[PDB]
Symmetry: D2
Subunit: 336 residues, 4 copies
Amino acid sequence: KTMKAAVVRAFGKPLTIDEVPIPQPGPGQIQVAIQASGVCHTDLHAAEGDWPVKPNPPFIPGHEGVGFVSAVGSGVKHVKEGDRVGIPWLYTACGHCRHCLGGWETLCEEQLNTGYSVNGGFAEYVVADPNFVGHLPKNIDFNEIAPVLCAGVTVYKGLKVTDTKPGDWVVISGIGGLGHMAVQYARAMGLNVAAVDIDDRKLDLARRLGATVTVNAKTVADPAAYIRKETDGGAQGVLVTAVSPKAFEQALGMVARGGTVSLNGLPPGDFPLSIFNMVLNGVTVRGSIVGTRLDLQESLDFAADGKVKATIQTGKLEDINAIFDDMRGRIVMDLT
Amino acid sequence: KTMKAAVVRAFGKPLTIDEVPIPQPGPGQIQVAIQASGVCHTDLHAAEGDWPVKPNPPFIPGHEGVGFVSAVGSGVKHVKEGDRVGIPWLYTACGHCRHCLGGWETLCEEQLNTGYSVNGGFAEYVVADPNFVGHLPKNIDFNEIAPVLCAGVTVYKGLKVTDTKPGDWVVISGIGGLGHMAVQYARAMGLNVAAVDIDDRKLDLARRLGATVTVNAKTVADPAAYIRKETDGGAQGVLVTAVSPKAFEQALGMVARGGTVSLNGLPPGDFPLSIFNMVLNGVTVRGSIVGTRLDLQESLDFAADGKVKATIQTGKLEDINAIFDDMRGRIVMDLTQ
Amino acid sequence: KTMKAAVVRAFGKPLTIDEVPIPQPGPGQIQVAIQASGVCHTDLHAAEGDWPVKPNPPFIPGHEGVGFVSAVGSGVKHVKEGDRVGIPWLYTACGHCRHCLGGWETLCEEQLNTGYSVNGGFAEYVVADPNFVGHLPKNIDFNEIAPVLCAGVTVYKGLKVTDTKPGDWVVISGIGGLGHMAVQYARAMGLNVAAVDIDDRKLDLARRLGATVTVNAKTVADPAAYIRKETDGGAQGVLVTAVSPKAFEQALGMVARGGTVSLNGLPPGDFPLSIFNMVLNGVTVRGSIVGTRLDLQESLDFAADGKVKATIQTGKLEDINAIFDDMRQGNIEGRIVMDLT
Amino acid sequence: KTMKAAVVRAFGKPLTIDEVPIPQPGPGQIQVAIQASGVCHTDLHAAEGDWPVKPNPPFIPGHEGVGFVSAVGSGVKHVKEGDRVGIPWLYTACGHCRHCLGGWETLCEEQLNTGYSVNGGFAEYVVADPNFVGHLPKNIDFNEIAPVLCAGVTVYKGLKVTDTKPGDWVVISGIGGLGHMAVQYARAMGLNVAAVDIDDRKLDLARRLGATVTVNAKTVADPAAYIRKETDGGAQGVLVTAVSPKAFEQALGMVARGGTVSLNGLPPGDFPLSIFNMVLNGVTVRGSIVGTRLDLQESLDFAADGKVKATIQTGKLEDINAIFDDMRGRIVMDLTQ
Ligand SMILES: NC(=O)C1=CN([C@@H]2O[C@H](COP(=O)(O)OP(=O)(O)OC[C@H]3O[C@@H](n4cnc5c(N)ncnc54)[C@H](O)[C@@H]3O)[C@@H](O)[C@H]2O)C=CC1
Ligand SMILES: [Cl-]
Ligand SMILES: [Cl-]
Ligand code: NA
Ligand SMILES: [Zn+2]
Ligand SMILES: [Zn+2]
Ligand SMILES: [Zn+2]
Ligand SMILES: [Zn+2]
Ligand SMILES: [Zn+2]
Ligand SMILES: [Zn+2]
Ligand SMILES: [Zn+2]
Ligand SMILES: [Zn+2]
């Protein structure tokens, strides 16, 4: 009784694909047989040991694992065998702090994070807290639902915290794995959608997915001015999904007075902010990643109802190191 | 036929106290006999020509002018001679844009600004738009009410946009002209208040005005860490009233996850922002200066009801250059000299 | 010298079509040559004297009058002859009270109301306050746009104050002039829509406009119980646009715990409220009145962009009494708009 | 082996003080040694079997029990023996529905209610779910903190859902067990407070607690008009703590346009609501009872900081039937004396 897993033995060094023991579920735990497993840029930073707070090698990355509940520990009510579930970034949270009690468990200072501070989905099996798994709709293929668990909920919640309403303009900055999803959520939320990127093929994709205003930030000299023109003075919201220094600076020129910039990236270093302009223009800048368990259910319901579909590129657990190179739509590893 | 006025005739040069004609109110305008006139850092930036959009010299600064209506122009309703009014930063706004129609006239792209793009209250008389003046409470002396027109409304609105509630912790960063008023608004809004400054005197003022936690940012090893400990993981709101590089950095370390930093200053240059930390911690950073006509009325009511009282240093119109040097509580010129 | 106008002379009696003087704009006013004029059930309530505060006959009803600016009074800025405008219920407001300053001018105690406390658009010309007219999208026909000036703006704002979010369920109660517009706004706002009425043709209209759940409250004893079943325990929002108090009473049973029932309809009298159920279930009931000038602009942009479209049949000013019979008897599909061209 | 408990053996019959087994904590549970136990009108309605969904007799009422954790079942992290805790109305909730996941566990369709659907605190021990107990501030006596668990949290959350802000006027209708606490929470929330009741003595108490505007609804012919005059046009919020036909009708007359009436009682029957008035005035009427776990913690912190203090009258478990007669400020049975 062993399983295949991609394991980070040491930071920076390529992951070894080893045969390890099948983790078993204690009380209050469950076991999931992973059918598909999405790859996020966060998994990259996990393997690099790049961030202030680091994993402890050896560990299995991955927080877009989806499959079937294969075993159920004692005490576990509700989640039964065969249940279709996903194991997202938020592995568990304390349940008693003011963040947890107020519907903001994503902020819990004692959370554990799947594929980071505990073993994740880059593997055939994973043990998880059933109180925090995502319940997946039956009508959506595993390869296709996997990205909702991080990219999808991230951009959905990101849009909610723009504080916009139907009829408003929202700018999606970056039409990659996160952004192509965000265009679809934004349309389903009744927003008029503008898209910004450096690649005309991605803007073409945004248009097909419902963006009605597009601008190429490399070939147009002043993309912020272009967006202000097309939105009568700027967008009420901007979601920045790929936070390069240029994208951030331009995002701040695209937002209308009183508007909100919502940031989803986890880039390194400091970025320059004109406090003068933020204050004069009454602008809000706000960070958001992932979402609460309720945000994730809501985000899954949009996929279930056909409003949101991820463009995916499929792969195998063995492609993990090449995948990470290609990174340096969404990649999902099919474990079938 | 003429009045005394402090005029900026050239950027960066001394203001002259000049005898200039008394502006007369046309249709839809009123005239105000100024009794007191507050001085703001914005006036200094107006006189220096520091900012990207500049005044057009010669002009009279001042957007904290308070006094009595002295003449009423054709067609003006309700306002009469003797009414107590102030002429704040927002001189007028278009009344038809989405910002104006939504009750956010402070954002109007066509606004004029008192003592910046039109003449202001550093003079014995001002012509104003009666739809935009502040209506002052009769029980508060002019010298004392003047600072509510810019400092008070700024920190009051700044606090409203921290998105906090009674019982939450808020930090007031900087206990100067703005900050000492912010302490009082914050306590009146049911907040628990922490104060941060670099001067123990200002911190003791904060305490007497209601702050139950104080920290000296220069004499403590890690002021942010100390604030987080005293507020059980950080403040739900942080109001930054004096925006130095260090105060901004420390402010971001003081906010709880999911919290909001409200910025009230107009410092030059760019400040470093860790997006990684903003995103991981779910933090909001928001700019807010002055406020709408309704924000100002609400701010004035707190003064009317004794909940907020400005500490003022009085001066004379003639002192205005000396006053600008001192700046390089609140300064208020008393025109009943 | 004169124009044609439909005038209420006495409550409950037929309106007469009379030649009256053309109103002339004074300072700060405009005149509008009316091209189309929506018939709102408020005009009927005003013609019947249904409400505790009544108009003062003789008056011209109509607050869904749309057309071209035909003259401009002294001092008026921006508006010019030929501009496409509508004169809605909120004719004017004071501009200085706390409601007006804080984005809630629809609550202003000094407002005047078009076709009620001032003469309205059941006439060839209206004199208006240009500060409060709707500015109409040029790509939409007058007959089609007219209902947005009240039916549209009202249900748009009514939906905003349900405090719902995309993906939530909303129930529209009463699929008439307001209600058929409400189904469409709700769908454009990202809501799933249930519809309730007392006539299967109105439920069919709802379904064609995007409702995916329907129930007939005249044939089904407990419509609320069917709604709850079809929405997993109730809708997060309910908009009552109906003209019967019993609708209001039954709406309270359609909302999920923590949900909000938004009230637009204005039948006379009271409905019984179970305070017990409201408190146990954490329910909100909220009255919603037309919309602010900003709400109106937003609501017009939906019609401009093709996201909503009023279902209309045109009539003539002379037919107003037959139109009121039709309205009273529930034989209007959507809205009747009088065409004055 | 056994314990004292007041047991409802049959609806509408006197409670029998019986000798019953001590409940034992299974896994995921704790046992609490009750020191004080507040009585609420809800306990009377439970005993009487008045409501559509009823208890299943025999049962022990009481959802304001406070005391010391006396044993801890297996699996229970965090909560320990000797911990100071209360067992409020919300005994448990499912933790997986949209209400529970959204921070609105008070609305959970699968909740159990202490002293109603499970045995409660009218006894020396109670078995509780540690995830849902209230953690009491160490500085407040048991008799004094008990009412916060229902009365206090009820009016606090009630006030939060008036959607008001500091400086607004709120009216507290009914100054009894709930309302005298409500006056104190409202003042601590920065509200200007008006009070309505039929008894000059309760209005005098409301004044001592911070209400500046008072009216006797029995001796003043038109109390709503009085309140409208005194609040310059109506209150932005009204909290109705005792919901009679007359108090409801008057509350709706006291609210400004766009204001909010928050209802805290569970009265029988139907109440007339004018549709025309609700719509033209843009009024909100909303129901609220008790609160979430977070709401309760917040309400407890106000008690801990001395901003809210319940007036209590003490009694004994054996008095319960006499207490209910008296019923048909807050009564708290002291189980130590
Ligand atoms: N609050 C506000 O701002 C506004 C309110 N109104 C009011 O809204 C109401 C509706 O106006 P319109 O749409 O023009 O009327 P309409 O006559 O076009 O539609 C009324 C609809 O209510 C339905 N209905 C009647 N009894 C019902 C019941 N028991 N259950 C469900 N549906 C029922 C009818 O079948 C009809 O479909 C009127 O009272 C009117 O005065 C109108 C405009 C604005
Ligand atoms: Cl495509
Ligand atoms: Cl949609
Ligand atoms: Na695991
Ligand atoms: Zn936690
Ligand atoms: Zn991720
Ligand atoms: Zn404007
Ligand atoms: Zn200023
Ligand atoms: Zn007004
Ligand atoms: Zn109407
Ligand atoms: Zn639940
Ligand atoms: Zn109770």
